[PDB]
Ligand binder design. Structure first.
Ligand SMILES: N[C@@H](Cc1c[nH]c2ccccc12)C(=O)O
Ligand SMILES: [Mg+2]
Ligand SMILES: [Mg+2]
Ligand SMILES: [Mg+2]
Ligand SMILES: [Mg+2]
Ligand SMILES: [Mg+2]
Ligand SMILES: [Mg+2]
Ligand SMILES: [Mg+2]
Ligand SMILES: [Mg+2]
Ligand SMILES: [Mg+2]
Ligand SMILES: [Mg+2]
Ligand SMILES: [Mg+2]
Ligand SMILES: [Mg+2]
Ligand SMILES: [Mg+2]
Ligand SMILES: [Mg+2]
Ligand SMILES: [Mg+2]
Ligand SMILES: [Mg+2]
Ligand SMILES: [Mg+2]
Ligand SMILES: [Mg+2]
Ligand SMILES: [Mg+2]
Ligand SMILES: [Mg+2]
Ligand SMILES: [Mg+2]
Ligand SMILES: [Mg+2]
Ligand SMILES: [Mg+2]
Ligand SMILES: [Mg+2]
Ligand SMILES: [Mg+2]
Ligand SMILES: [Mg+2]
Ligand SMILES: [Mg+2]
Ligand SMILES: [Mg+2]
Ligand SMILES: [Mg+2]
Ligand SMILES: [Mg+2]
Ligand SMILES: [Mg+2]
Ligand SMILES: [Mg+2]
Ligand SMILES: [Mg+2]
Ligand SMILES: [Mg+2]
Ligand SMILES: [Mg+2]
Ligand SMILES: [Mg+2]
Ligand SMILES: [Mg+2]
Ligand SMILES: [Mg+2]
Ligand SMILES: [Mg+2]
Ligand SMILES: [Mg+2]
Ligand SMILES: [Mg+2]
Ligand SMILES: [Mg+2]
Ligand SMILES: [Mg+2]
Ligand SMILES: [Mg+2]
Lengths: 114, 209, 123, 118, 16, 56
RNA sequence: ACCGAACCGACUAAUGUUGAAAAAUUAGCGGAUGACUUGUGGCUGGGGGUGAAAGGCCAAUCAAACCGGGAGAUAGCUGGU
RNA sequence: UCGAUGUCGGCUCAUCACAUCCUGGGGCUGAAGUAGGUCCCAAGGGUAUGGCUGUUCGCCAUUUAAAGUGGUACGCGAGCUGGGUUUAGAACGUCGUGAGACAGUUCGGUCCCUAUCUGCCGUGGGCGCUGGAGAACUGAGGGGGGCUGCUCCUAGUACGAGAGGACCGGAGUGGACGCAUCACUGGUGUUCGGGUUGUCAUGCCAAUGGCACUGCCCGGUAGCUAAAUGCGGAAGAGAUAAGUGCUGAAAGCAUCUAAGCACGAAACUUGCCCCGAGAUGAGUUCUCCCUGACCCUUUAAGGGUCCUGAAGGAACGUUGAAGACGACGACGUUGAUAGGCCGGGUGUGUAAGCGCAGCGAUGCGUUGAGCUAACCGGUACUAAUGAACCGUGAGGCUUAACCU
């Protein structure tokens, strides 16, 4: 309702970049080990985007040392420090869930040149 | 300590700066008007009665209107009672806000949990189903056996059977108070509270502690 | 969410390839073992010249699950396998000398500091 | 439990429901008053009224959208030629339900559903 | 005539 | 399963105690035609709230 | 000989069991040019027929059909009087 | 009991006893500590998964604080199964001359019932509660819940030659169980969007629709939900069991008991949550409503006529995170109750038409376009009609106290 939208709107971020599924993206997140706080980078293809305002999330997939890793980031969370898209991908779908079953040359994504 | 009557508005998250997201329930707790104060002399116990919100003037019946006019306050949507401890006293016609709950850490939230209708034994009592195959015939989600043979030759009281589930008064205890917001009339507690969205709740300071 | 009779890959170089979770230790009627949890395993495939043979029963720590871990801001880290690191029955320190693949910060305790030190990537 | 769900099942499967609401929308547009059972009249409101809005905004693509929902060129023509400009100043509520008793055969609540300017 | 559960043998010979 | 003893006319009446119909509380007069009708229903002639809604 | 419809059959499961049906329905299943299957007609008769044999089948009945007769068999048994 | 009381095992649901398996309290020890042995109190909760086998049992593997012993028609087939033992087929070994027979074995083999009554789980109607009614309560009583591991500090302290290693108290974090919820991660989402095979149709191209399990698939809103995430078990108090005592005689001593006094457990009564005045012992508080006339008689808690119809309710309609039906909640023009409409949000993924490139399938621009169910904020366009109906007219007798 109006109250919930007001609370969410005073919590949301103001500078999330516009990215679409298929994009290769670097997400720098905060990692706290011991007492030191630093930035760890996760680079991969956004395979899913769920837009719900404050509750918006996006699923990124990478291949890490021979293992496929999916991370679902909360877009407005303080731990997600920075999002930067490196490569625009050309897909015809909103959720790229076949990239799990595909591997290697088959998981290639064409570049979106406009 | 007495409580306040609010309404469940919905749930949200609160991101806090060490980056943890607290699931909060937002309870709109606007000003509750003390209507009647009861005492040991006249009624035999100590309580206050509060009302909240507003109700249609053509639908406030004459006894309710007379009661509210005797207190001298505008008609609300209901009447609730709160037992008083010994050190605390209130007067008739008096407004109470969330600034009372400004200094509490945990609350007890009471509301009418949602009605699931006539529910079965598997949904109601966590009964186990029987086999879906291996010959089983028309007995997949049935209750099973409900007794012993000739002794006692009866079904014992309180036997867990199917029936009405939900739509009933439920208390969730010891919920953290994430935020008290006086100017917007908001109480943000951590976690879920019983009932549907837009529904009446009674929030009291925690009794367990 | 690893239960009994579950086939897991070995994320170290002890000499096994597949193992089967046969018991979830640490509780009565316990059903599942998440990331960072001790299980009892038996070995179903082995490298011919490994440190362990087929048919050994020993312990393991679940370090990767397809169900994934949840992070306190609400995040979730999922993998494409179930992978464990073998441990002795008594010492409960790893047998192998190297760990393959990423592991998670949910193993960051003093019990598994060797695994965290030898892992290639800690997510 | 059907908390916050809409629509009536009407003792028919989904294809039968869609087919008869297409038929009833065609009949109601053709005749401008029809007598049907009361829940069928309420669901006929929910089917018919967006078709009159689509008729308010005239285009070739809107005509093609109405031919896909009514599958009838005569109904599409009468919509876009008459009920567009007739209701062009009215914001919703193009129909009216008047209860008229119970069927002799099976004791039903009948109701006339009619367009408002008839 | 007769009921099938009376003609049957597994339930009629229930207590031999 | 089936009864062991025959129920009586007393218990038959007690079960049928709740079977009684309820007549309509009151009919209506129309402000134009003057005909009694069910409330929120059009009349037999085709009037409703004083307007001829259906022809004939 | 092989795969597979018609056609013949009846291996498994659920439904039904005061059934839609005094033996079926649904989904799968076996044979399907042969020791095959089928229409019309004929023949074999009850201690008898016929039987690639189950005491199986002989008109919803079979360790001896059905119908009438000896017959109101007999009943140291049960019920009723 | 033979004019029938269905049998082992499994499943589902259990409930009771205590001769206690764990957790709780203590005495003795051939009890240094850790771990035990044995006995006494204690029934609040808890009290394995698999391999083999028809198995209960047992053995084995691996856990747990523990994997209790029994009753209940060796609980439970008008609740499921049908592996075993129990019909008809067939075979083996053995017995018999044979038909056949074996608590010997092996393969195959129809498990019915629409619930009248009691019981139990839910949910209503009537009347009562002494004028009628709307609310909020009090709490007699009744039920739910009651489990526990591990790590860390105290402390490598007490104890011990070493090895080892605490009681008491405190902090954190788990397993099983239970309630609530849908903000998150998910599942469903045959009512939304798209891809596509075959075929048919809309005169034909283009575009669409029907049918094939939703034709097959890919996503997915709201709702419902768990695997998701909040909370819980308590602390405290009273009276105690085993047990430990203080003072103290009977019995000049001694003695926990006879007089008197104090401790003492998850059992008991409360404390926590829910139902709860049909609690016929029907309770309390606050508010609202009704202040006419007349006639008969077996002259009393009597009947009848006219006038009057209140507070409230019911009915009717729009309906709901409420619901089998009743019921409960919101609203009825002085209106946001539902549908529609407007704007947004979400989901899908760049519509059709046209133009351009290509021989063409097709690609690009208009274009994150079109469409978008149950969602969010709004808006009287449609539907919730004036009425009519039920409910009355000051409410018994006796005895005390107050005013007068
Ligand atoms: N009960 C089944 C089989 C059956 C028919 N007649 C029987 C006689 C006896 C035993 C079983 C049956 C049926 O009705 O079709
Ligand atoms: Mg409901
Ligand atoms: Mg089960
Ligand atoms: Mg059956
Ligand atoms: Mg709705
Ligand atoms: Mg029907
Ligand atoms: Mg279809
Ligand atoms: Mg009898
Ligand atoms: Mg052949
Ligand atoms: Mg045959
Ligand atoms: Mg057969
Ligand atoms: Mg068949
Ligand atoms: Mg063959
Ligand atoms: Mg063949
Ligand atoms: Mg024989
Ligand atoms: Mg025959
Ligand atoms: Mg003979
Ligand atoms: Mg003779
Ligand atoms: Mg005779
Ligand atoms: Mg009998
Ligand atoms: Mg004892
Ligand atoms: Mg207790
Ligand atoms: Mg066993
Ligand atoms: Mg038994
Ligand atoms: Mg038993
Ligand atoms: Mg049995
Ligand atoms: Mg029984
Ligand atoms: Mg058998
Ligand atoms: Mg035999
Ligand atoms: Mg031989
Ligand atoms: Mg025998
Ligand atoms: Mg049965
Ligand atoms: Mg109880
Ligand atoms: Mg939601
Ligand atoms: Mg999803
Ligand atoms: Mg789907
Ligand atoms: Mg679709
Ligand atoms: Mg074409
Ligand atoms: Mg067709
Ligand atoms: Mg206590
Ligand atoms: Mg003395
Ligand atoms: Mg007890
Ligand atoms: Mg509206
Ligand atoms: Mg969008
Ligand atoms: Mg299209």
């Amino acid at each position: 309702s109006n109250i919930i939208k007001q609370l969410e709107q005073e919590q949301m971020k103001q500078d999330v970049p516009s990215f679409r599924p298929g994009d290769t993206v670097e997400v720098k997140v905060w990692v706290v080990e011991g007492s030191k706080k630093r930035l760890q980078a996760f680079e991969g293809v956004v395979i899913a985007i769920r837009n719900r305002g404050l509750h918006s999330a996006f699923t990124v997939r990478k291949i890490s040392n021979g293992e496929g890793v999916e991370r679902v980031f909360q877009t407005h969370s303080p731990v997600v420090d920075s999002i930067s898209v490196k490569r625009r991908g050309a897909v015809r779908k909103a959720k790229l869930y076949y990239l799990r079953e595909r591997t290697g040359k088959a998981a290639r994504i064409k570049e979106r040149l406009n | 300590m007495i409580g306040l009557v609010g309404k469940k508005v919905g749930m949200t998250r609160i991101f806090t700066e060490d980056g943890v997201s607290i699931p909060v329930t937002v309870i709109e707790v606007e000003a509750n008007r003390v209507t009647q104060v009861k005492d040991l002399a006249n009624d035999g116990y100590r309580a206050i009665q509060v009302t909240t919100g507003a109700k249609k003037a053509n639908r406030v019946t004459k006894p309710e209107a007379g009661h509210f006019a005797k207190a001298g306050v505008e008609a609300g949507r209901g009447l609730w009672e709160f037992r008083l401890a010994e050190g605390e006293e209130f007067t008739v016609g008096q407004s109470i806000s969330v600034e009372l709950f400004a200094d509490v850490k945990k609350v007890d939230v009471t509301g009418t949990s949602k009605g699931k209708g006539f529910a079965g034994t598997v949904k109601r009592w966590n009964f186990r189903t029987q086999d879906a195959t291996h010959g089983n015939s028309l007995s997949h989600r049935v209750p099973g056996s409900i007794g012993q043979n000739q002794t006692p030759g009866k079904v014992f009281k309180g036997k867990k059977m199917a029936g009405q589930m939900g739509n009933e008064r439920v208390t969730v205890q010891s919920l953290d108070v994430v935020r008290v917001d006086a100017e917007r009339n908001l109480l943000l507690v951590k976690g879920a509270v019983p009932g549907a969205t837009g529904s009446d709740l009674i929030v009291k300071p925690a009794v367990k502690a | 969410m690893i239960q009994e009779q579950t086939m897991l890959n070995v994320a170290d170089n002890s000499g096994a390839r597949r193992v089967m979770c046969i018991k979830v230790l640490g509780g009565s009627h316990r059903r599942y073992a998440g990331v960072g949890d001790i299980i009892k395993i038996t070995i179903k495939e082995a490298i011919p010249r490994g440190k362990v043979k087929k048919g050994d029963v020993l312990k393991a720590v679940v370090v990767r699950t397809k169900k994934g871990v949840r992070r306190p801001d609400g995040s979730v880290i999922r993998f494409d396998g179930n992978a464990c690191v073998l441990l002795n029955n008594n010492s409960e320190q790893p047998i192998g000398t190297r760990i393959f693949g990423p592991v998670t910060r949910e193993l960051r305790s003093e019990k598994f500091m060797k695994i965290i030190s030898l892992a290639p990537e800690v997510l | 439990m059907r908390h916050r769900k809409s629509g009536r099942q009407l003792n028919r499967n989904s294809s039968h429901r869609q087919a008869m609401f297409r038929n009833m929308a065609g009949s109601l547009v053709r005749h401008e008053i029809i007598k049907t059972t009361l829940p069928k009249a309420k669901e006929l409101r929910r089917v018919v009224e967006p078709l009159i809005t689509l008729a308010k905004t005239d285009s070739v693509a809107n005509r093609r959208l109405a031919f896909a929902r009514t599958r009838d060129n005569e109904i599409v023509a009468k919509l876009f030629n008459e009920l567009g400009p007739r209701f062009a100043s009215r914001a919703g509520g193009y129909t009216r339900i008047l209860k008229c008793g119970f069927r002799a055969g099976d004791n039903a609540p009948m109701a006339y559903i009619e367009l408002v300017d008839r | 005539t007769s009921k099938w559960f009376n003609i049957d043998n597994k339930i009629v010979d229930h207590r031999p | 399963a089936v009864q062991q003893n025959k129920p009586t006319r007393s218990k038959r009446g007690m079960r049928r105690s709740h079977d009684a119909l309820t007549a309509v509380t009151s009919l209506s007069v129309d402000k134009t035609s003057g005909e009694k009708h069910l409330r929120h229903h059009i009349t037999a002639d085709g009037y409703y709230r004083g307007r001829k809604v259906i022809a004939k």
